[PDB]
Amino acid sequence: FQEAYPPLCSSDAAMLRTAHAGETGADEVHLAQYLIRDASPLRGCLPL
Amino acid sequence: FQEAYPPLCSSDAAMLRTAHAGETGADEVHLAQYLIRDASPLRGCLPL
Amino acid sequence: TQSDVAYTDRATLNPWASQKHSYGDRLYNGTYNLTGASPIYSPCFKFFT
Amino acid sequence: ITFIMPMGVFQANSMDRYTRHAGDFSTVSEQDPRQFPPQGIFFYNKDGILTQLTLRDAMGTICHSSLLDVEATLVALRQQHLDRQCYFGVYVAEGTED
Amino acid sequence: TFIMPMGVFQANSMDRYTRHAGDFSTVSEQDPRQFPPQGIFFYNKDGILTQLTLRDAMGTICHSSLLDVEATLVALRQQHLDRQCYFGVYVAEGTED
Amino acid sequence: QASVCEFVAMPVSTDLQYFRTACNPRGRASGMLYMGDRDADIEAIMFDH
């Protein structure tokens, strides 16, 4: 099938950690430091 | 005869994407741009 | 000269308590037996010996 | 089916200077590109992740021929009597021997 | 395959957009929070992050042994360009002028 | 266990909707699937044009 998609990502001083554990707050851009959200296997794997 | 179908928009979609996929942008508008929307058939299929 | 086996990005988080004879190791490692006469249990004794 | 479609549109009736929740597309300073016209055309194609249409083409396109147009259209409406209208002034001349 | 990008800063200036507020900038007066991205604090199995920030320069880019220019332009001496040309080209030695 | 990375120097500013559309690195078609509309010139689709 020849490809690869991008993820539910995280980790800035503005966007790194879990405090919340599930699916968190929800910004979707601000200027020029990013995060990234999911596109593949699991709408629900990674719980800490 | 005469009349018309549609879907849901946002043009500065700097009124388009923060984190949802569901029912998100509906108050028509944010600063000076043009934020079209939604009235042909299918509501809520096929997540983004 | 080699790996931190846990977090393989660096040698060791703090270079003050991880070398052969660093301050941390000279203070708590049971082999040197610095705190033998102290009757107080040392909670980090098991992490260094 | 058919539909129709768009580039940025504008309103007219001067009735919309409102507000709801805010500190806006504005910085320490005043007026670079924000009190201004929208952007345009883009899209969002097959299965979940949107697409551009900003600034590139109408030039294979209206250098076009059937617009200067005068034979057959006016032709197809020849023969009446043209509604109340006279000069306001259109004729012309050459000096005035004065 | 999933495939992970890691280097740029967009020289935008197109798509300003946003989700959060005035809750926020950093501590004092002037508002630059304009960091684009450098390399990567990342996790592992069961508690622990490691970091693909980069800090040996030391993957790929510059490399040399494309010190090697007879074969690919073995796709550049048997197909054909568009001519650029012949006063197209001048800085040299004299004519007693 | 083992892992190995394949980077190729990606882009500052025209696009984050192909950072929104996703994929294999390689980028635009070579592959194999839909065949037929002529076959034997195995030199000129990702080697000519």
From Swiss-Prot, chains A, B:
* Span covered, complete protein: 1347 to 1394 of 1396
Protein task: Self-assembles to form an icosahedral capsid with a T=16 symmetry, about 200 nm in diameter, and consisting of 150 hexons and 12 pentons (total of 162 capsomers). Hexons form the edges and faces of the capsid and are each composed of six MCP molecules. In contrast, one penton is found at each of the 12 vertices. Eleven of the pentons are MCP pentamers, while the last vertex is occupied by the portal complex.
Q: Which domain of life is it from?
A: Viruses
Q: Subunit structure, per the record?
A: Homomultimer. Makes the hexons and eleven out of twelve pentons. Interacts with triplex proteins 1/TRX1 and 2/TRX2; adjacent capsomers are linked together in groups of three by triplexes, heterotrimeric complexes composed of one molecule of TRX1 and two molecules of TRX2. Interacts with scaffold protein; this interaction allows efficient MCP transport to the host nucleus. Interacts with capsid vertex component 2/CVC2. Interacts with the small capsomere-interacting protein/SCP.
UniProt-recorded name of the protein: Major capsid protein
Subcellular compartments: Virion; Host nucleus
* Similarity field: Belongs to the herpesviridae major capsid protein family.
Swiss-Prot record, chain E:
| Full protein stretch here | 418 to 514 of 1396
Question: Per its record, how is this protein called by name?
Answer: Major capsid protein
Function, as annotated? Self-assembles to form an icosahedral capsid with a T=16 symmetry, about 200 nm in diameter, and consisting of 150 hexons and 12 pentons (total of 162 capsomers). Hexons form the edges and faces of the capsid and are each composed of six MCP molecules. In contrast, one penton is found at each of the 12 vertices. Eleven of the pentons are MCP pentamers, while the last vertex is occupied by the portal complex.
Gene name linked to the record: MCP
According to its UniProt entry, this protein's organism is Varicella-zoster virus (strain Dumas) (HHV-3)
Q: Where in the cell is it found?
A: Virion; Host nucleus
**Quaternary organization:** Homomultimer. Makes the hexons and eleven out of twelve pentons. Interacts with triplex proteins 1/TRX1 and 2/TRX2; adjacent capsomers are linked together in groups of three by triplexes, heterotrimeric complexes composed of one molecule of TRX1 and two molecules of TRX2. Interacts with scaffold protein; this interaction allows efficient MCP transport to the host nucleus. Interacts with capsid vertex component 2/CVC2. Interacts with the small capsomere-interacting protein/SCP.
| Family of this protein | Belongs to the herpesviridae major capsid protein family.
